[PDB]
Enzyme design. Structure first.
Site, short mmCIF file in Angstrom:
data_model
loop_
_atom_site.label_atom_id
_atom_site.label_comp_id
_atom_site.label_asym_id
_atom_site.label_seq_id
_atom_site.Cartn_x
_atom_site.Cartn_y
_atom_site.Cartn_z
CE1 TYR A 28 -4.43 -0.85 -0.04
CE2 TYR A 28 -3.32 -2.90 1.10
CZ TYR A 28 -4.53 -2.12 0.30
OH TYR A 28 -5.53 -2.80 0.03
N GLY A 30 2.93 3.86 -1.20
CA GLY A 30 3.44 4.32 -2.60
C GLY A 30 2.09 4.33 -3.60
N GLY A 32 -0.76 3.42 -5.49
CA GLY A 32 -2.08 2.43 -5.55
C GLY A 32 -1.88 1.60 -4.29
CG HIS A 48 -2.20 8.23 4.05
ND1 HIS A 48 -1.60 8.58 2.86
CD2 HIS A 48 -2.28 9.42 4.74
CE1 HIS A 48 -1.35 9.72 2.83
NE2 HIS A 48 -1.48 10.51 3.74
CG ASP A 49 -3.22 4.06 -0.14
OD1 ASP A 49 -2.34 5.15 -0.14
OD2 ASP A 49 -3.02 3.27 -1.08
CE1 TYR A 52 -3.82 12.05 2.10
CE2 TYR A 52 -2.93 12.14 -0.08
CZ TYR A 52 -2.97 12.44 1.29
OH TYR A 52 -1.76 13.29 1.50
CE1 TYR A 73 -0.53 19.58 6.01
CE2 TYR A 73 -1.62 18.59 4.24
CZ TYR A 73 -0.65 18.48 5.19
OH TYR A 73 0.24 17.30 5.02
CG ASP A 99 -1.42 14.12 4.36
OD1 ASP A 99 -0.84 14.96 3.96
OD2 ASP A 99 -1.80 13.33 3.94
CA LIG Z 1 -1.03 3.60 -1.71
#
Ligand SMILES: [Ca+2]
Length: 123
Positions: A28, A30, A32, A48-49, A52, A73, A99
């Site tokens: 995960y 990096g 995709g 995190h992915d 987003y 931000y 983040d």
């Molecule tokens: Ca990723």
């Protein structure tokens, strides 16, 4: 960017160069990411992915036809603790939180160097 995010990780992990170390890790971290997270760090990234992906479905962003990938931000770093700046609009505060949580997640999980540059067919 990246840039802000890169700066957050360093705030919690002062010894690292995050675009080198946390890039191309597991399934995960990096570009995709699919399959099952290979360790706790991979899961940090999976989350995190996900955070987003969620940010894009948010009204506050969906104007401001926002790109999580480009969301602009402010945050400060003091003593290795990150604070997302009040001045952020909702959309940018959502991204900053994404983040922020990752930064922190990264600093609490083991680093398994056997998972760097993984074959995604293990994904
Ligand atoms: Ca990723």
């Amino acid at each position: 960017x990246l840039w802000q995010f890169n700066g957050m990780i360093k705030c919690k992990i002062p010894s690292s160069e995050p675009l080198l170390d946390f890039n191309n890790y597991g399934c995960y971290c990096g570009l995709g990411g699919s399959g099952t997270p290979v360790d706790d760090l991979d899961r940090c990234c999976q989350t995190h992915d996900n955070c987003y992906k969620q940010a894009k479905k948010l009204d506050s962003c969906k104007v401001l036809v926002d790109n999580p990938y480009t969301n602009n931000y402010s945050y400060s770093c003091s003593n290795n603790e990150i604070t997302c700046s009040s001045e952020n609009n909702a959309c940018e505060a959502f991204i900053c939180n994404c983040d922020r949580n990752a930064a922190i997640c990264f600093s609490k999980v083991p680093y398994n160097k056997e998972h760097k540059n993984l074959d995604k067919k293990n994904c």
